[PDB]
Write a protein that holds these residues in place. Structure first.
Motif, PDB file in Angstrom:
ATOM      1  N   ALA A   1       0.840  -1.127  -0.174  1.00  0.00           N
ATOM      2  CA  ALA A   1       0.129   0.030  -0.002  1.00  0.00           C
ATOM      3  C   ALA A   1       0.864   1.223   0.066  1.00  0.00           C
ATOM      4  CB  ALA A   1      -0.886   0.041   1.268  1.00  0.00           C
ATOM      5  N   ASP A   2       0.579   2.119  -0.917  1.00  0.00           N
ATOM      6  CA  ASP A   2       1.726   3.250  -1.182  1.00  0.00           C
ATOM      7  C   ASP A   2       0.663   4.397  -0.604  1.00  0.00           C
ATOM      8  OD1 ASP A   2      -0.232   3.581  -3.444  1.00  0.00           O
ATOM      9  OD2 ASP A   2       1.372   3.347  -4.842  1.00  0.00           O
ATOM     10  N   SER A   3       1.488   5.600  -0.417  1.00  0.00           N
ATOM     11  CA  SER A   3       0.918   6.928   0.252  1.00  0.00           C
ATOM     12  C   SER A   3       1.304   8.075  -0.278  1.00  0.00           C
ATOM     13  CB  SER A   3       1.055   6.687   1.659  1.00  0.00           C
ATOM     14  OG  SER A   3       0.559   7.917   2.247  1.00  0.00           O
ATOM     15  N   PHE A   4       0.642   8.409  -1.486  1.00  0.00           N
ATOM     16  CA  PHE A   4       0.964   9.778  -2.362  1.00  0.00           C
ATOM     17  C   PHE A   4      -0.152  10.407  -2.589  1.00  0.00           C
ATOM     18  CE2 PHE A   4      -0.155   8.532  -6.381  1.00  0.00           C
ATOM     19  CZ  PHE A   4      -0.124   7.049  -6.420  1.00  0.00           C
ATOM     20  N   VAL A   5      -0.231  11.864  -2.621  1.00  0.00           N
ATOM     21  CA  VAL A   5      -1.198  12.657  -3.295  1.00  0.00           C
ATOM     22  C   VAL A   5      -0.827  13.216  -4.317  1.00  0.00           C
ATOM     23  CG1 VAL A   5      -2.565  14.694  -2.513  1.00  0.00           C
ATOM     24  CG2 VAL A   5      -2.048  12.958  -0.690  1.00  0.00           C
ATOM     25  N   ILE A   6      -1.787  13.286  -5.465  1.00  0.00           N
ATOM     26  CA  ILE A   6      -1.360  13.752  -6.748  1.00  0.00           C
ATOM     27  C   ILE A   6      -2.212  15.024  -6.939  1.00  0.00           C
ATOM     28  CG2 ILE A   6      -0.781  11.662  -7.749  1.00  0.00           C
ATOM     29  CD1 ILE A   6      -3.266  11.387  -9.066  1.00  0.00           C
ATOM     30  N   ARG A   7      -2.006  15.996  -8.132  1.00  0.00           N
ATOM     31  CA  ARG A   7      -2.903  17.009  -8.239  1.00  0.00           C
ATOM     32  C   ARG A   7      -4.109  16.487  -8.977  1.00  0.00           C
ATOM     33  NH1 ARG A   7       0.065  21.184 -12.481  1.00  0.00           N
ATOM     34  NH2 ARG A   7      -0.370  19.615 -13.710  1.00  0.00           N
ATOM     35  N   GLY A   8      -5.164  17.240  -8.604  1.00  0.00           N
ATOM     36  CA  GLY A   8      -6.523  16.902  -9.384  1.00  0.00           C
ATOM     37  C   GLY A   8      -7.590  16.169  -8.363  1.00  0.00           C
TER      38      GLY A   8
END
Lengths: 41, 49
Positions: free
Chosen positions: A1-8
């Motif tokens: 499980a990865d943990s990142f925030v992208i634009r949009g």
């Protein structure tokens, strides 16, 4: 499980900017960050 | 322009750089078919509208 925030980038996962494509075998669990990890914006 | 009176525009001879375009504020999305966003820097075109 990865943990990142992208634009949009929500149509893809720009993001050559750190290679996790659609044909990678997995599931995407996603929700908006504007309710918890936010401010006025 | 308006939807019924949309303006015609053709792009002439141009050395196109797309890597400076996708992070401009009106050009965030590329939701379409028939072209690839990571491949437009290596393709050649007869004309662009």
């Amino acid at each position: 499980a990865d943990s990142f925030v992208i634009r949009g980038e929500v149509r893809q996962i720009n993001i050559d900017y750190n290679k996790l494509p659609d044909d990678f075998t997995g599931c995407v669990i996603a929700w908006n960050s504007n309710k918890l990890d936010s401010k006025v914006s | 322009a308006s939807v019924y009176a949309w303006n015609r525009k053709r792009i002439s001879n141009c050395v196109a750089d797309y890597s400076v375009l996708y992070n401009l504020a009106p050009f965030f999305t590329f939701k379409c078919y028939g072209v690839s966003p990571t491949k437009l820097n290596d393709l050649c075109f007869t004309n662009v509208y």
